[PDB]
């Protein structure tokens, strides 16, 4: 296969620290996930991720009111603005201070930004998307004004409706009113009188009343009325009223001015929304146990979006219907393992939070969170059938869920109490093997019986990796006795052939055509063994290829750090030609299993807020008291629940205290996609899905000189030789041209074209018609294509079965979509109509 992997969407986390945004249409939700920004399309269930990546976590998101330009601010103020229709990175520009407020003007020409005390209003740069004859300038941002008439952190900035004034809400307890240019009857007045600093100052619709919401839970109205001695008027205060959330301080409020309603989210997680100018409590409820960090409102006004930072906890709330639109949760611990579903539409990941959840690859949302484990969940696995999921965990139980009814029909335990750390399951789905670190025996239960079949034994150490062979005949265990075992269980003799290695076994993986196995040791080397004649046929010494390190709290050079020089997990391709290998390090290696070379190396994260993402830390961050990202700075926090350190001394694997400042980078699980053309990896930032880039890269198959798109359309339209045109298009390998000729040939000549089509281009054609069935609205046409293809090349595919397994799998799931989506409805409709017609 072609190993040209770009970065497709991030997944597995839905929100991290930062600002939330809606589209001006109201459908897309822009949320920051570490150092990237996902877009969740909510009208059609979709999601994507912008191709940029900041060096630190996102601080702010802003969006131009036309909709097109997004401006994302990292920590330390590095800004990237990008075009949202054509998802491309446009400008990089560094505000030199940490941005703590940001707001674009509703006219669209300006944007104001609050760096800690400063307030800079900038022009919005002219872009190649908007000008006809235009290009990228060098320094596109032109500063308009700077205001340092201020004394503490600028916590909020809100423009007017006519975009001539704006309000800056502060941490020095005073909101101020500023102008864009010098107006006639205006002085830049201050609005003093609070108790704990303003959260937000907002205008009204007709800009007379301006409201200020402060941190203690009080919202005050401000009007331009005369002083009580009566030209002479003053911005003074007409009434004040208080949210009576008892033992909490409000963290974020928003105000929809067209519909006049104010929402406020508090420290105890219970938000409340109020029809403001008379202050009637519309309602209030508790969305989160921890707190609420960022609230935004729809432009229409009918949706609210809340984000809690300590967990994932992103949720949109439709308030008049009183129901969630989405309530999504990312993992707040280390993602221990993951597996794709055998269809390939959804992946399921298991973290040390205790929960497992099933994410959908499109639309990026978790669809079910199984929460029966009472401790951290280790390896999860599927069967061949794909309906049953088996999950092991440290609470001692291998549970067994059925995904058509969503309930664990089995739970398995060992009689003496163990804590399972690895597991495998027979592809028939009838035998589960699992192994732990406490005892060195390896347990086997039956799924259809429920009781313990056996304790296999012969290991002189804890068994680290288990793998059942995909045909179903051989278990392979790998353990810290520097050994692996070919267990043959299902035969009448139960036998064990040892493979003696050089160090502790860390990972075991099979080839799909089961004759080969790759086992990854603790030296950092991969050894490719054969399973029939148990001899090592191949080997890679891969320490240097994965060694990228130097965490904080690491007094070795990144070249001398041992521990990030091994492969904790390895997976073959669905082709079987390329391993993918990932350990406790920044790099993912993609090896070839025949030619034994590293085809491509990837970097999981650019994010410098994680700990081990650059192998040469700079000496600017080393003070005389250790590094600068190591001093405990909890005491400089305004909130007590942020100041309290409920951490346990020496707890590597999770504690609920979980200081978690600068977490390490480690790839704890990798998996290829069963439909091919993608893999994904569970990092600490999220769940990165890499995929092949075929539409942005010219790559012909075996091309001649007289074969152009013009010549292909010429022999299509003039000559009308459909087989020649289709073979020329598949030879050029341009998907638009292939789609054009594929739709252009007629449905009676499909059979002639397929009968005279070549068998070297048969699997590419099968993959193309599978994609066209799953995407295009030409369903009967693509099904006639599939029918003619399998009826003509029937014995060839059944004779091969290994060279074409992924093509048959994607054709099978395309017709599974068409079998479950339309024909159940057609049959149910015709039976209901027959009954109602028969009275």
């Amino acid at each position: 296969m072609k190993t040209n992997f770009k970065f497709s969407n991030l997944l597995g986390t839905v929100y991290c620290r930062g600002n939330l945004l809606f589209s001006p249409d109201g459908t897309h939700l822009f949320s920051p996930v570490g150092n990237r920004v996902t877009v969740f399309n909510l009208v059609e269930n979709k999601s994507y991720t912008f191709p940029f990546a900041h060096r630190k976590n996102i601080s702010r998101i802003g969006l131009t009111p036309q909709g097109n330009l997004l401006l994302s601010i990292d920590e330390d103020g590095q800004a990237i603005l990008t075009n949202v229709p054509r998802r491309v990175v446009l400008y990089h520009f560094s505000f030199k201070s940490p941005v703590t407020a940001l707001a674009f003007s509703p006219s669209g020409r300006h944007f104001v930004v609050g760096l800690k005390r400063k307030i800079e209003v900038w022009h919005v740069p002219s872009t190649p998307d908007t000008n006809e004859d235009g290009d990228l300038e060098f320094a596109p941002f032109v500063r308009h004004h700077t205001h340092m008439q201020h004394f503490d952190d600028v916590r909020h900035l809100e423009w007017s409706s006519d975009s001539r004034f704006f309000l800056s809400a502060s941490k020095d307890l005073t909101a101020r009113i500023w102008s864009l240019d010098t107006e006639e009857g205006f002085v830049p007045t201050v609005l003093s009188g609070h108790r704990q600093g303003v959260v937000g100052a907002y205008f009204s619709k007709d800009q007379e009343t301006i409201y200020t919401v402060s941190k203690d839970g009080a919202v005050f109205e401000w009007k331009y009325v005369a002083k009580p001695g009566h030209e002479d008027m003053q911005w003074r205060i007409v009434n004040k009223h208080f949210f009576m959330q008892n033992a909490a301080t409000l963290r974020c409020a928003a105000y929809h001015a067209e519909s006049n309603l104010l929402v406020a989210g508090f420290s105890n997680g219970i938000f409340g929304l109020y029809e403001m100018p008379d202050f009637n409590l519309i309602h209030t409820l508790s969305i989160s146990q921890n707190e609420i960090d960022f609230v935004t409102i729809n432009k229409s006004g009918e949706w609210l979006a809340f984000g809690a930072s300590k967990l994932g906890q992103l949720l949109v709330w439709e308030w008049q219907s009183e129901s969630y639109i989405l309530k999504q949760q990312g993992h707040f611990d280390a993602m221990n393992s993951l597996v794709y579903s055998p269809d390939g539409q959804r992946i399921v990941t298991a973290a040390d939070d205790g929960k497992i959840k099933v994410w959908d690859v499109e639309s990026g949302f978790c669809i079910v969170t199984f929460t029966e484990h009472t401790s951290g969940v280790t390896a999860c696995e599927f069967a061949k059938k794909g309906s049953v999921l088996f999950t092991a965990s440290l609470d001692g139980s291998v549970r067994a869920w059925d995904l058509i009814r969503y309930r664990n029909f089995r739970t398995f335990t060992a009689p003496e109490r163990l804590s399972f750390t690895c597991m495998a399951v027979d592809p028939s789905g009838e035998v589960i093997a699992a192994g732990s670190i406490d005892s060195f025996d390896i347990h086997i239960w039956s799924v259809q019986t429920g009781q313990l079949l056996d304790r296999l034994s012969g290991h002189e150490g804890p068994v680290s990796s288990l793998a059942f062979a995909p045909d179903g005949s051989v278990l392979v265990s790998g353990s810290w006795d520097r050994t692996a075992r070919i267990w043959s269980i299902f035969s009448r003799t139960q036998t064990s052939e040892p493979l003696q290695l050089q160090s502790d076994v860390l990972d075991v993986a099979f080839r799909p055509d089961s004759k080969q196995i790759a086992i990854s040791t603790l030296d950092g080397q991969l050894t490719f063994w054969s399973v029939s004649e148990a001899q090592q046929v191949s080997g890679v010494d891969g320490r240097r290829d994965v060694s990228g390190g130097r965490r904080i709290t690491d007094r070795r050079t990144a070249a001398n750090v041992a521990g990030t020089k091994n492969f904790n997990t390895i997976r073959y391709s669905m082709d079987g030609t390329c391993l993918l290998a990932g350990g406790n390090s920044k790099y993912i290696c993609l090896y070839s299993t025949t030619t034994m070379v590293l085809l491509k190396k990837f970097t999981v994260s650019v994010n410098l807020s994680l700990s081990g993402t650059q192998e040469f830390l700079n000496s600017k961050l080393m003070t005389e008291a250790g590094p600068v990202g190591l001093l405990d700075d909890q005491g400089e926090a305004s909130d007590l629940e942020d100041r309290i350190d409920r951490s346990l001394p020496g707890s590597k694997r999770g504690d609920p205290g979980a200081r978690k400042k600068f977490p390490e980078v480690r790839v704890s699980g990798v998996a290829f996609s069963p439909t091919g053309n993608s893999f994904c990896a569970a990092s600490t930032e999220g769940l990165l899905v890499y995929s092949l880039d075929n539409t942005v890269q010219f790559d012909p198959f075996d091309l001649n000189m007289e074969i152009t798109p013009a010549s292909t359309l010429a022999v299509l339209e003039k000559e009308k030789d459909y087989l020649k045109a289709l073979v020329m298009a598949f030879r050029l390998n341009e998907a638009g041209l292939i789609t054009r000729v594929y739709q252009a040939i007629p449905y009676t000549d499909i059979g002639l074209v397929v009968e005279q089509f070549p068998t070297v281009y048969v699997p590419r054609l099968l993959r193309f018609v599978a994609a066209q069935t799953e995407q295009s609205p030409h369903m009967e046409f693509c099904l006639l294509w599939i029918r003619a293809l399998i009826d003509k090349h029937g014995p060839w595919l059944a004779a091969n079965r290994g060279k074409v397994d992924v093509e048959l799998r994607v054709v099978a799931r395309a017709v599974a979509k068409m079998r479950d989506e339309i024909r159940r409805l057609a049959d149910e409709n015709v039976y209901m109509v027959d009954y109602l017609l028969n009275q």
Partner: protein, 89 residues
């Protein structure tokens, strides 16, 4: 060492699996998925002796047969099979 296993029971309803799904704008299942009622037909109704009629018995097959229509030979054989189960226990 984790904990001794203590029995915990979970009450599932007869709602569809899209009531166990998480909150999102639309389901991830198709149109065929979403009618699976989260408890099997064996839990909706299972024919047994505790839910049989007065005159009838239910067999191991789940079929109501009455004691009046049952012959003497089948009565003797059913008595022998129940006595065989009692001897096994």
């Amino acid at each position: 060492k984790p904990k001794p296993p203590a029995p915990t029971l979970t009450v599932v309803s007869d709602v569809a699996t899209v009531a166990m799904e998480d909150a999102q704008p639309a389901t991830a299942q198709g149109v065929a998925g979403g009618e699976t009622s989260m408890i099997a037909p064996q839990e909706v109704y299972a024919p047994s002796k505790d839910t049989a009629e007065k005159g009838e018995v239910v067999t191991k097959a789940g079929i109501p047969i009455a004691k009046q229509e049952m012959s003497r030979e089948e009565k003797l054989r059913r008595r022998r099979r129940e006595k065989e189960r009692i001897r096994k226990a």
